[PDB]
Design a binder for these strands. Structure first.
Ligand SMILES: [Mg+2]
Ligand SMILES: [Zn+2]
Length: 261
RNA sequence: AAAAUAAAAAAAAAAAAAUUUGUAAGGUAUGUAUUAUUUUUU
């Protein structure tokens, strides 16, 4: 509105600043079918992103807004999009107005337009599932994100809270020191899908955090999906919210019978 | 009218043929595992 509705979206990265489509150097000879390096051993080829999303700075109106686009630019979520106001996808954070237009389609697609799959994955990776609506994002790689300096677990919790706060309605956050894991639950599926792409392979450390010069050498903070919550308080709370949303559609499933008569 | 040519001395010198060229397999096994404190809430 102040950020989005008045502005036009800017260009995060110029096309000459875009990274090379060739990966770095893993093996001896480059395979030109699969676009990978061959003949040797790979060396833990993950790396942190040189760019990132700036919600208030980079949002603005796009050509997807004028045409009626439902879906969001995934390169805008990564902080990489080079089209700016020419891009056919939306450059702003998903909100209650646009998510209301992602209603029939969001059952099988995500907010970027990618199909979901039946099984999840062995490591709970990229896209979601069309069987379970999972609104909670796992956070890992926090040691690799902080670039191996030490902090207190109370202060790690706040540094996770701030960068995730902009990406949508945060339901709850509970950083665990015993297992260095962040369980960040949102209000919406579409904001969990946006936040998973946006903060994947990023750095936690701030520009004043004394290692802002050296932060590119990391691995970034892993952002996968979260499993079911084993403590029995939330499971009863899961049983509660299952029952009350059921009765909400017990009302409307006898209204369209009342329309039927 | 028919013919349109009804024949030598008496035995001489002179040679040819044509072929088809290289590759892979049956031998040095096959199989398993291997960077992940890259930490999934009690
Ligand atoms: Mg045989
Ligand atoms: Zn874009």
């Amino acid at each position: 509105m102040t950020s989005w509705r008045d502005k036009s979206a800017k260009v995060q990265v110029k096309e000459s600043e875009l990274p090379s489509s060739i990966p770095a150097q893993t093996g001896l000879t480059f395979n030109i079918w699969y676009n990978k390096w061959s003949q040797g051993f790979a060396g833990n080829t993950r790396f942190v992103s040189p760019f990132a999303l700036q919600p208030q700075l980079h949002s603005g109106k796009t050509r997807g807004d004028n045409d009626g686009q439902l879906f969001f630019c995934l390169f805008f979520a990564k902080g990489m999009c080079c089209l700016g106001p020419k891009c056919e996808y939306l450059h702003h954070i998903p909100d209650e107005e646009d998510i209301g237009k992602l209603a029939l389609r969001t059952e099988v697609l995500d907010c970027f337009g990618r199909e979901k799959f039946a099984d999840y994955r062995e490591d709970m990776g990229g896209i979601g599932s069309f069987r379970k609506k999972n609104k909670t994002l796992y956070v890992g790689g926090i040691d690799g994100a902080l670039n191996s300096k030490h902090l207190k677990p109370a202060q790690i919790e706040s540094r996770i809270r701030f960068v995730f706060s902009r990406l949508g309605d945060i339901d709850r956050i509970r950083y665990v020191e015993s297992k260095n894991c962040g369980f960040v639950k949102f209000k919406y599926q579409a904001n969990a899908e946006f936040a998973k792409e946006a903060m994947s392979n990023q750095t936690l450390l701030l520009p004043s955090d004394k290692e802002w010069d050296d932060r590119r050498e990391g691995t970034g903070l892993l952002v996968k999906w979260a499993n079911e919550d084993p403590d029995p308080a939330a499971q009863k709370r899961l049983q509660e919210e299952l029952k009350l949303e059921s009765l909400n559609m017990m009302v409307h499933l006898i209204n369209n019978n009342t329309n039927s008569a």
